[PDB]
Design an enzyme around this catalytic site. Structure first.
Site, PDB file in Angstrom:
ATOM      1  N   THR A 159       0.791  -1.231   0.000  1.00  0.00           N
ATOM      2  CA  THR A 159       0.000   0.000   0.000  1.00  0.00           C
ATOM      3  C   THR A 159       0.817   1.271   0.000  1.00  0.00           C
ATOM      4  OG1 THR A 159      -1.701  -1.180   1.100  1.00  0.00           O
ATOM      5  CG2 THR A 159      -1.873   1.202   1.204  1.00  0.00           C
ATOM      6  N   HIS A 265      -8.109  -9.332   2.528  1.00  0.00           N
ATOM      7  CA  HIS A 265      -7.202 -10.065   3.398  1.00  0.00           C
ATOM      8  C   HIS A 265      -7.888 -11.208   4.171  1.00  0.00           C
ATOM      9  CE1 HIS A 265      -3.408  -8.011   3.089  1.00  0.00           C
ATOM     10  NE2 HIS A 265      -4.059  -6.871   3.099  1.00  0.00           N
ATOM     11  N   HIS A 420      -0.850  -9.497  -0.651  1.00  0.00           N
ATOM     12  CA  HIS A 420      -0.242  -8.891  -1.818  1.00  0.00           C
ATOM     13  C   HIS A 420       1.121  -8.459  -1.409  1.00  0.00           C
ATOM     14  CE1 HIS A 420      -1.021  -5.089   0.277  1.00  0.00           C
ATOM     15  NE2 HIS A 420      -2.196  -5.622   0.568  1.00  0.00           N
ATOM     16  N   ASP A 680      26.275  -1.396 -14.397  1.00  0.00           N
ATOM     17  CA  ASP A 680      25.633  -0.789 -13.247  1.00  0.00           C
ATOM     18  C   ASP A 680      26.187  -1.370 -11.910  1.00  0.00           C
ATOM     19  OD1 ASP A 680      23.929   0.992 -11.934  1.00  0.00           O
ATOM     20  OD2 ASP A 680      22.202  -0.266 -12.016  1.00  0.00           O
ATOM     21  N   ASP A 684      22.232   1.671  -9.361  1.00  0.00           N
ATOM     22  CA  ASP A 684      21.328   2.845  -9.340  1.00  0.00           C
ATOM     23  C   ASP A 684      20.377   2.929 -10.550  1.00  0.00           C
ATOM     24  OD1 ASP A 684      23.225   3.741 -11.273  1.00  0.00           O
ATOM     25  OD2 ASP A 684      23.533   5.601 -10.198  1.00  0.00           O
TER      26      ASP A 684
HETATM   27  C1  LIG Z   1      14.052   8.153 -10.866  1.00  0.00           C
HETATM   28  O1  LIG Z   1      13.898   9.585 -10.831  1.00  0.00           O
HETATM   29  C2  LIG Z   1      14.666  10.190  -9.798  1.00  0.00           C
HETATM   30  C3  LIG Z   1      14.389  11.681  -9.726  1.00  0.00           C
HETATM   31  O2  LIG Z   1      14.769  12.270 -10.980  1.00  0.00           O
HETATM   32  C4  LIG Z   1      16.140   9.889 -10.030  1.00  0.00           C
HETATM   33  O3  LIG Z   1      16.822  10.119  -8.795  1.00  0.00           O
HETATM   34  C5  LIG Z   1      17.630  11.290  -8.834  1.00  0.00           C
HETATM   35  O4  LIG Z   1      18.875  10.892  -9.357  1.00  0.00           O
HETATM   36  C6  LIG Z   1      19.832  11.969  -9.488  1.00  0.00           C
HETATM   37  C7  LIG Z   1      21.144  11.429 -10.057  1.00  0.00           C
HETATM   38  O5  LIG Z   1      21.657  10.306  -9.296  1.00  0.00           O
HETATM   39  C8  LIG Z   1      20.053  12.648  -8.136  1.00  0.00           C
HETATM   40  O6  LIG Z   1      20.930  13.788  -8.283  1.00  0.00           O
HETATM   41  C9  LIG Z   1      21.805  13.948  -7.103  1.00  0.00           C
HETATM   42  O7  LIG Z   1      21.308  14.945  -6.188  1.00  0.00           O
HETATM   43  C10 LIG Z   1      22.081  15.117  -4.991  1.00  0.00           C
HETATM   44  C11 LIG Z   1      21.347  16.105  -4.099  1.00  0.00           C
HETATM   45  O8  LIG Z   1      20.130  15.407  -3.835  1.00  0.00           O
HETATM   46  C12 LIG Z   1      19.275  15.992  -2.840  1.00  0.00           C
HETATM   47  O9  LIG Z   1      18.334  16.897  -3.434  1.00  0.00           O
HETATM   48  C13 LIG Z   1      17.269  16.311  -4.202  1.00  0.00           C
HETATM   49  C14 LIG Z   1      16.451  17.428  -4.851  1.00  0.00           C
HETATM   50  O10 LIG Z   1      15.846  18.269  -3.855  1.00  0.00           O
HETATM   51  C15 LIG Z   1      16.431  15.398  -3.289  1.00  0.00           C
HETATM   52  O11 LIG Z   1      15.281  14.875  -3.980  1.00  0.00           O
HETATM   53  C16 LIG Z   1      17.333  14.270  -2.764  1.00  0.00           C
HETATM   54  O12 LIG Z   1      16.586  13.324  -1.937  1.00  0.00           O
HETATM   55  C17 LIG Z   1      17.145  11.965  -1.907  1.00  0.00           C
HETATM   56  O13 LIG Z   1      17.941  11.671  -0.749  1.00  0.00           O
HETATM   57  C18 LIG Z   1      17.222  11.710   0.488  1.00  0.00           C
HETATM   58  C19 LIG Z   1      18.137  11.055   1.506  1.00  0.00           C
HETATM   59  O14 LIG Z   1      18.766  12.122   2.197  1.00  0.00           O
HETATM   60  C20 LIG Z   1      15.848  11.014   0.513  1.00  0.00           C
HETATM   61  O15 LIG Z   1      15.018  11.617   1.517  1.00  0.00           O
HETATM   62  C21 LIG Z   1      15.078  11.020  -0.813  1.00  0.00           C
HETATM   63  O16 LIG Z   1      14.128   9.929  -0.734  1.00  0.00           O
HETATM   64  C22 LIG Z   1      16.054  10.877  -1.995  1.00  0.00           C
HETATM   65  O17 LIG Z   1      16.645   9.556  -1.897  1.00  0.00           O
HETATM   66  C23 LIG Z   1      17.055   8.914  -3.119  1.00  0.00           C
HETATM   67  O18 LIG Z   1      18.115   9.625  -3.812  1.00  0.00           O
HETATM   68  C24 LIG Z   1      19.477   9.582  -3.272  1.00  0.00           C
HETATM   69  C25 LIG Z   1      20.502  10.309  -4.174  1.00  0.00           C
HETATM   70  O19 LIG Z   1      20.121  11.684  -4.408  1.00  0.00           O
HETATM   71  C26 LIG Z   1      19.882   8.117  -3.046  1.00  0.00           C
HETATM   72  O20 LIG Z   1      21.174   8.025  -2.449  1.00  0.00           O
HETATM   73  C27 LIG Z   1      18.851   7.369  -2.195  1.00  0.00           C
HETATM   74  O21 LIG Z   1      19.153   5.991  -2.211  1.00  0.00           O
HETATM   75  C28 LIG Z   1      17.435   7.460  -2.747  1.00  0.00           C
HETATM   76  O22 LIG Z   1      17.394   6.543  -3.856  1.00  0.00           O
HETATM   77  C29 LIG Z   1      18.597  14.852  -2.056  1.00  0.00           C
HETATM   78  O23 LIG Z   1      18.345  15.318  -0.719  1.00  0.00           O
HETATM   79  C30 LIG Z   1      23.498  15.540  -5.344  1.00  0.00           C
HETATM   80  O24 LIG Z   1      24.239  15.650  -4.139  1.00  0.00           O
HETATM   81  C31 LIG Z   1      24.157  14.499  -6.251  1.00  0.00           C
HETATM   82  O25 LIG Z   1      25.462  15.008  -6.616  1.00  0.00           O
HETATM   83  C32 LIG Z   1      26.646  14.145  -6.529  1.00  0.00           C
HETATM   84  O26 LIG Z   1      27.026  13.416  -7.731  1.00  0.00           O
HETATM   85  C33 LIG Z   1      27.228  14.357  -8.838  1.00  0.00           C
HETATM   86  C34 LIG Z   1      27.185  13.763 -10.256  1.00  0.00           C
HETATM   87  O27 LIG Z   1      26.868  14.832 -11.182  1.00  0.00           O
HETATM   88  C35 LIG Z   1      28.509  15.161  -8.628  1.00  0.00           C
HETATM   89  O28 LIG Z   1      28.670  16.119  -9.679  1.00  0.00           O
HETATM   90  C36 LIG Z   1      28.432  15.919  -7.305  1.00  0.00           C
HETATM   91  O29 LIG Z   1      29.789  16.292  -6.973  1.00  0.00           O
HETATM   92  C37 LIG Z   1      27.807  15.089  -6.151  1.00  0.00           C
HETATM   93  O30 LIG Z   1      28.881  14.302  -5.596  1.00  0.00           O
HETATM   94  C38 LIG Z   1      29.253  14.687  -4.253  1.00  0.00           C
HETATM   95  O31 LIG Z   1      28.605  13.829  -3.294  1.00  0.00           O
HETATM   96  C39 LIG Z   1      28.881  12.434  -3.512  1.00  0.00           C
HETATM   97  C40 LIG Z   1      28.007  11.580  -2.578  1.00  0.00           C
HETATM   98  O32 LIG Z   1      28.082  12.001  -1.207  1.00  0.00           O
HETATM   99  C41 LIG Z   1      30.401  12.222  -3.369  1.00  0.00           C
HETATM  100  O33 LIG Z   1      30.755  10.875  -3.698  1.00  0.00           O
HETATM  101  C42 LIG Z   1      31.229  13.157  -4.277  1.00  0.00           C
HETATM  102  O34 LIG Z   1      32.642  12.913  -4.073  1.00  0.00           O
HETATM  103  C43 LIG Z   1      30.782  14.643  -4.142  1.00  0.00           C
HETATM  104  O35 LIG Z   1      31.153  15.344  -2.923  1.00  0.00           O
HETATM  105  C44 LIG Z   1      23.262  14.266  -7.484  1.00  0.00           C
HETATM  106  O36 LIG Z   1      23.253  15.429  -8.323  1.00  0.00           O
HETATM  107  C45 LIG Z   1      18.711  13.045  -7.468  1.00  0.00           C
HETATM  108  O37 LIG Z   1      18.844  13.467  -6.107  1.00  0.00           O
HETATM  109  C46 LIG Z   1      17.759  11.863  -7.431  1.00  0.00           C
HETATM  110  N1  LIG Z   1      16.459  12.324  -6.948  1.00  0.00           N
HETATM  111  C47 LIG Z   1      15.640  11.568  -6.203  1.00  0.00           C
HETATM  112  C48 LIG Z   1      14.326  12.188  -5.819  1.00  0.00           C
HETATM  113  O38 LIG Z   1      15.931  10.436  -5.832  1.00  0.00           O
HETATM  114  C49 LIG Z   1      16.434   8.437 -10.370  1.00  0.00           C
HETATM  115  O39 LIG Z   1      17.790   8.413 -10.856  1.00  0.00           O
HETATM  116  C50 LIG Z   1      15.440   7.866 -11.350  1.00  0.00           C
HETATM  117  N2  LIG Z   1      15.695   6.453 -11.506  1.00  0.00           N
HETATM  118  C51 LIG Z   1      15.949   5.869 -12.688  1.00  0.00           C
HETATM  119  C52 LIG Z   1      16.240   4.382 -12.703  1.00  0.00           C
HETATM  120  O40 LIG Z   1      15.910   6.476 -13.736  1.00  0.00           O
HETATM  121 CA   LIG Z   2      -3.120  -1.280  -0.329  1.00  0.00          CA
HETATM  122 CA   LIG Z   3      25.150   2.951 -12.166  1.00  0.00          CA
HETATM  123 ZN   LIG Z   4      -3.478  -4.998   2.130  1.00  0.00          ZN
END
Ligand SMILES: *[C@@H]1O[C@H](CO)[C@@H](O[C@@H]2O[C@H](CO)[C@@H](O[C@@H]3O[C@H](CO[C@H]4O[C@H](CO)[C@@H](O)[C@H](O[C@H]5O[C@H](CO)[C@@H](O)[C@H](O)[C@@H]5O[C@H]5O[C@H](CO)[C@@H](O)[C@H](O)[C@@H]5O)[C@@H]4O)[C@@H](O)[C@H](O[C@H]4O[C@H](CO)[C@@H](O)[C@H](O)[C@@H]4O[C@H]4O[C@H](CO)[C@@H](O)[C@H](O)[C@@H]4O)[C@@H]3O)[C@H](O)[C@H]2NC(C)=O)[C@H](O)[C@H]1NC(C)=O
Ligand SMILES: [Ca+2]
Ligand SMILES: [Ca+2]
Ligand SMILES: [Zn+2]
Ligand SMILES: Cc1nnn(Cc2cc(C(F)(F)F)ccc2CCC(=O)N2CCN(Cc3ccc(S(N)(=O)=O)cc3F)CC2)n1
Ligand SMILES: [Cl-]
Ligand SMILES: [K+]
Ligand code: NA
Length: 802
Positions: A159, A265, A420, A680, A684
C-alpha cells in the site's frame, strides 16, 4: 502535548493544518490523537443518515443533521448527495446516458477543471469484469471514459509504496517508502504501519502532487483521511470544499478507501464476502457523481479511479520457514510475508556472512517457493536496490506464498486468505485505472501502463510542471483529449567517428589467432561503407547522450557503435528475416579472433587477457551463427564484436543467439535485434562512468559488464516483415544479469531448452530501463509519432497469461 480546549467551530476539515499545542480539526487529527474536544460533535455529524427522504424535503435547516434537505442546502453546498433526486425529480448520474464531454462545462469562476482522485486499496484489475453487475457507477465511468485493462503497480506491491509512487512518479527506491515496514540505518530508526514514526517527514522523499500543486499556486485538498472518518463524510467534505469561493477552493482532491483490501485479506480476492465491499465502493462513487451533478460539476471535473495493487490467495499453510534452511536462525532479522528482507540481528556479530545465508537458501527443496537474491541481482525491472533501507539480502516469494522466520511467528500473531506484495508483473497484483472527464478521451481503451506514469498526467491535468520523476512524460498522451505535453527527443551529445582502414595486421599484438576478386571486392568495401545499413539499422542509430569517444562500424550483417573507452560496442544492431538460416561455427574458426583494421591496437581488446583470466571467457554481440554467408561470417569474429563473458553466462547467451533469435524471427516475421553491455556496479539503474567499474578482465583495461541487454523489435502487424513495416512496432527486451554461476536457475544442470528462456522472461525489461542504463536513446528515425514511440519504450512484455 495538545491543548484540546480550542474549538472546531467553523474550522471543520480545515485545509491549513495548525501547529501544537493548538488543537486540530483537519482530516488527519484523529490519527495523531489531537482533535479539539468538539470535533466529533461539529465535524462528524451523523444525525438522520446520509440520504434525503420525501418527508425531509423542504425541511427547516437543522444544523445537527449529517447532510441537509432544506431549500438553502445547494448554496451552502451541504445537501445529501441524493437531494435533487428525491426532492426535485432529478435522475441519478448512473441512469443518464453518457454523452461526450468535449469541453469543460464548469461554473463561472473555475480557472481549470478540478481533479478528483478516487483511490481504492486492493482493487484488483479483474474486479472490473468479474464484479461488473454489482458496480454500475464504476462501469459507467469505465465505459464512458478512458480505461486500461489493468495498471501495473510498483514492487513491492504494498500500500504505502504504491500510494506514494502514485503521488510522486517515483520508484520506491527513490522516494524512500520501500515497504510498509522499514529500518533506516543512518537514522537508526524504524517505520511501521502502526504508530508515530511514519508521520516524520524525513521518510518521505520526492515531491508529491499536493506539494507540487501548492508550490506552483494550485490549491490542494488534503489527500489523507483518518480511518474513522466514514466514507460518506469524506465525499461530503470534498463536495463542500468544491462549494468554496474561488480564491479558497482547491483544484485537486483525493478520496481514499480501505476497501476492498481490508475484506480481501480476510476472505481472499474472490471470497463471496467480497461482493458487498464492491457494492459499497460503487455506492460511494455514485454519491460523488450525484453530488457533482447537483453542483453542475459532473461535466467539469476530471475523475481518476485508481488502485494501489491487487490481491492474491494466500493462507497460513502456504508458508516457508527460514528455520527449515538455516541452523543460525536467531542471528537474523527477517521482514516477512509476501517478500523477504534479511539483515543481521546485531551489527556487533562479525560472524554474520550474507554469502553463506544466500547459499543455505538456494535451491534447497525441489519445489522451494521463494528465491533468494543479493538486491543488486534482482531483475532490473523492479528497480529495487538503490536505497539504504532495502536490505542486501532479498527473497522474491512465489505468488500464493509467505515466508516467515520461525513457525511461532505465524501461529503467535488461520486468519488471512488474501495478501499482496509479490512481484509486480504477477496478474493477481495488477490494479485499475479509469479516467473520466473533459480532459480524458471518450469511450477509449488504452493499453496497460505502469503507475509511475500517472504523476506526469495528473500534473498535465492541473497545468503543473512535474518534479523530476521516473515516468516518461508523453508516454500517456494518448489518454488525453487535450493538455498533452509535447516532448522533444533528447539531443545527441557525442557524435560518432566513421573510421576507415588505418592499421595493418602486423601492428596488432593481441595473442589472437584466426585460421583465415573484383566483383566481390568492390562489394565487401560497400558493406564496410554501410550499403546494407538500411536493413540492419531500421530505426536510426541510437543517440549517445553523454560525452565519450566512439566509432560506427559497418558490416554486411550488422552495424555497431564501438566504444574506444570501454573497448567494446555500446550497441550492435542486426536484422534476421523470417527466412534466415542458422549455421554453426566451423571448426577452423572455433577460437578465431581477428584484428579490426579500422580500430587501433590501443583501443582493442586482446585474447591474452582472456587466456590469463581463468574466470572470464568471451562471447560475441553479433552471433556468428546467423551470418548471411561463409564470407560474412569472418566479420563476426572481429575483436570489436567481442565482449567478456563468464562460462556460466555463455550457456545462456549461446542459446539465446543460436536458438531463440531464430525462433522469434520465425514467430514475428523477422526481428531487429540491438544488443549490448550494461555497467551498473552501484545498482542505481543508471549508466556507470569509467571510474565506477569494479571489475576488469584480469590484467587489462577491459571492463566487465554487470548485464547484457537486447531489444527485439518487429511489426505489430506481423503479416509485414520487420524490415518493411508501415505501421506500429512491437518490442520485447531483456537485461540479463552477467553472473559467473547459474545459481539463480535451480534446473540449470539441465539442457538450456528447460531454463534459459524462463530466465530471460524473469529479466524482461522496458526499452526505457535500457536507456537509463546505457545513456542511449533508441528509435530516433521512425515514421511514428514521438508519443507513440515513448509508449513503446515504456512497454514491458510480462509473459503472464490474459
Ligand atoms: C528516478 O527519478 C529520480 C528523480 O529524478 C532519479 O533520482 C535522482 O537521481 C539523481 C542522479 O543520481 C540525483 O541527483 C543527485 O542529487 C544530490 C542532491 O540530492 C538531494 O536533493 C534532491 C532534490 O531536492 C532530493 O530529492 C534528494 O533526496 C534523496 O535523498 C534523500 C536522503 O537524504 C531522501 O530523503 C530522498 O528519498 C532521496 O533519496 C534517493 O536519492 C538519493 C541520491 O540523491 C539516493 O542516495 C537514495 O538511495 C534514494 O534513492 C537529495 O536530498 C546531489 O548531491 C548528487 O550530486 C553528486 O554526484 C554528482 C554527479 O553529477 C557530482 O557532480 C556531485 O559532486 C555530487 O557528488 C558529491 O557527493 C557524492 C556523494 O556524497 C560524493 O561521492 C562526491 O565525491 C561529491 O562530494 C546528485 O546530483 C537526485 O537526487 C535523485 N532524486 C531523487 C528524488 O531520488 C532516479 O535516478 C530515477 N531512476 C531511474 C532508474 O531512472
Ligand atoms: Ca493497499
Ligand atoms: Ca550505475
Ligand atoms: Zn493490504
Ligand atoms: C502512503 C501514501 N502516500 N501518499 N498517500 C496519500 C494518498 C495518495 C493518493 C494518490 F493516489 F493520489 F497518490 C491517494 C490517496 C492518498 C490518501 C491515502 C490515505 O488516506 N491513507 C490513510 C492514512 N494512511 C496513513 C498515513 C497517515 C499520515 C501520513 S503523513 N502524511 O502525515 O506522514 C502518512 C500515512 F501513511 C495512509 C493511507 N498515502
Ligand atoms: Cl514490507
Ligand atoms: K579465460
Ligand atoms: Na543452478
Amino acid at each position: 502535548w495538545t491543548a484540546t480546549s480550542g474549538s472546531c467551530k467553523g474550522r471543520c476539515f480545515e485545509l491549513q493544518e495548525v501547529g501544537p499545542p493548538d488543537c486540530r480539526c483537519d482530516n488527519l487529527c484523529k490519527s495523531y490523537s489531537s482533535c479539539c474536544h468538539d470535533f466529533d460533535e461539529l465535524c462528524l455529524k451523523t444525525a438522520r443518515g446520509w440520504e434525503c427522504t420525501k418527508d425531509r424535503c423542504g425541511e427547516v435547516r437543522n444544523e445537527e443533521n449529517a447532510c441537509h434537505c432544506s431549500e438553502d442546502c445547494l448554496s451552502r453546498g451541504d445537501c445529501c448527495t441524493n437531494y435533487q433526486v428525491v426532492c426535485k425529480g432529478e435522475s441519478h448520474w448512473v441512469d443518464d446516458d453518457c454523452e461526450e464531454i468535449k469541453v469543460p462545462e464548469c461554473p463561472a469562476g473555475f480557472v481549470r477543471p478540478p481533479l478528483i482522485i478516487f483511490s481504492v486499496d486492493g482493487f484488483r484489475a479483474s474486479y472490473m469484469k468479474k464484479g461488473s453487475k454489482v458496480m454500475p457507477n464504476i462501469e459507467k465511468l469505465r465505459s464512458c471514459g478512458t480505461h486500461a485493462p489493468y495498471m501495473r503497480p510498483v514492487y513491492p506491491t504494498k500500500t504505502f509504496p504504491n500510494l506514494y509512487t502514485l503521488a510522486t512518479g517515483l520508484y520506491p527506491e527513490s522516494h524512500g517508502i520501500v515497504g510498509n515496514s522499514m529500518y533506516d540505518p543512518v537514522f537508526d530508526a524504524s517505520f511501521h504501519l502502526r504508530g508515530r514514526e511514519k508521520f516524520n517527514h524525513r521518510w518521505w522523499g520526492g515531491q508529491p502532487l499536493w506539494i507540487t500543486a501548492t508550490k506552483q499556486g494550485v490549491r490542494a485538498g488534503t489527500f489523507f483521511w483518518s480511518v474513522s472518518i466514514p466514507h460518506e463524510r469524506r465525499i461530503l467534505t470534498i463536495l463542500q470544499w468544491l462549494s468554496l469561493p474561488d480564491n479558497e477552493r482547491p483544484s485537486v482532491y483525493a478520496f481514499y478507501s480501505e476497501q476492498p483490501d481490508f475484506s480481501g485479506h480476510k476472505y481472499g480476492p474472490f471470497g463471496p464476502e467480497m461482493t458487498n465491499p464492491l457494492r459499497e465502493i460503487d455506492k460511494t462513487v455514485g454519491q460523488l457523481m450525484d453530488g457533482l451533478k447537483q453542483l453542475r460539476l459532473h461535466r467539469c471535473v476530471n475523475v481518476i479511479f485508481v488502485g494501489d495493487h491487487g490481491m492474491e490467495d494466500v493462507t497460513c499453510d502456504r508458508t516457508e520457514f527460514l528455520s527449515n534452511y538455516l541452523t543460525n536462525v536467531d542471528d537474523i532479522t527477517l521482514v516477512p510475508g509476501t517478500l523477504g528482507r534479511i539483515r543481521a540481528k546485531s551489527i556487533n556479530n562479525s560472524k554474520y556472512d550474507p554469502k553463506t545465508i544466500i547459499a543455505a537458501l538456494t535451491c534447497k527443496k525441489p519445489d522451494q517457493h521463494f528465491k533468494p537474491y543479493m538486491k543488486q541481482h534482482l531483475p532490473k525491472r523492479l528497480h529495487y536496490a538503490n536505497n539504504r533501507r532495502i536490505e542486501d539480502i532479498h527473497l522474491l516469494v512465489d505468488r500464493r506464498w509467505h515466508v516467515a522466520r520461525k513457525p511461532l511467528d505465524v501461529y503467535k500473531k488461520c486468519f488471512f486468505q488474501g495478501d499482496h506484495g509479490f512481484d509486480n508483473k504477477v496478474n493477481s497484483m495488477q490494479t485499475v485505472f479509469v479516467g473520466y472527464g473533459p480532459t480524458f478521451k471518450y469511450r477509449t481503451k488504452v493499453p496497460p501502463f505502469e503507475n509511475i506514469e500517472l504523476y506526469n498526467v495528473m500534473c498535465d491535468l492541473l497545468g503543473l510542471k512535474p518534479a523530476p520523476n521516473n515516468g516518461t512524460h508523453g508516454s500517456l498522451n494518448h489518454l488525453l483529449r487535450t493538455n498533452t505535453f509535447r516532448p522533444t527527443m533528447p539531443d545527441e551529445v557525442s557524435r560518432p567517428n566513421y573510421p576507415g582502414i588505418m592499421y595493418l595486421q602486423s601492428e596488432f599484438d593481441l595473442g589472437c589467432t584466426c585460421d583465415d576478386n573484383k566483383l566481390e571486392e568492390l562489394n565487401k568495401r560497400l558493406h564496410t561503407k554501410g550499403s546494407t545499413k538500411e536493413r540492419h539499422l531500421l530505426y536510426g542509430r541510437p543517440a549517445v547522450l553523454y560525452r565519450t569517444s566512439y566509432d560506427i562500424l559497418y558490416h554486411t550483417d550488422f552495424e555497431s557503435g564501438y566504444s574506444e573507452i570501454f573497448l567494446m560496442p555500446l550497441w550492435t544492431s542486426y536484422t534476421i528475416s523470417k527466412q534466415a538460416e542458422v549455421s554453426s561455427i566451423p571448426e577452423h574458426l572455433t577460437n578465431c579472433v581477428r584484428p579490426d583494421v579500422r580500430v587501433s591496437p590501443g583501443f582493442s581488446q586482446n585474447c591474452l587477457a582472456y587466456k590469463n583470466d581463468k574466470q572470464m571467457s568471451y562471447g560475441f554481440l553479433f552471433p556468428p551463427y546467423l551470418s548471411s554467408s561463409p564470407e560474412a561470417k569472418y566479420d563476426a569474429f572481429l575483436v570489436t564484436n567481442m565482449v567478456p563473458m563468464y562460462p556460466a553466462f555463455k550457456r545462456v547467451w549461446a542459446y539465446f543467439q543460436r536458438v531463440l533469435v531464430k525462433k522469434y524471427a520465425s514467430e514475428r516475421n523477422g526481428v531487429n535485434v540491438i544488443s549490448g553491455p550494461i555497467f551498473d556496479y552501484n545498482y542505481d539503474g543508471l549508466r556507470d562512468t569509467e571510474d565506477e567499474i569494479k571489475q576488469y578482465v584480469e590484467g587489462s583495461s577491459i571492463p566487465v559488464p554487470t548485464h547484457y541487454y537486447s531489444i527485439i523489435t518487429s511489426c505489430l502487424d506481423f503479416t509485414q516483415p520487420a524490415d518493411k513495416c508501415d505501421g506500429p512496432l512491437s518490442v520485447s527486451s531483456f537485461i540479463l544479469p552477467h553472473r559467473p554461476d547459474n545459481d539463480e536457475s535451480c534446473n540449470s544442470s539441465e539442457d538450456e531448452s528447460k531454463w534459459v528462456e524462463e530466465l530471460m522472461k524473469m529479466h524482461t525489461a522496458r526499452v526505457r530501463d535500457i536507456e537509463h542504463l546505457t545513456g542511449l536513446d533508441f528509435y530516433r528515425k521512425t515514421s511514428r509519432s514521438y508519443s507513440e514511440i515513448l509508449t513503446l519504450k515504456t512497454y514491458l512484455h510480462t509473459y503472464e497469461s490474459e
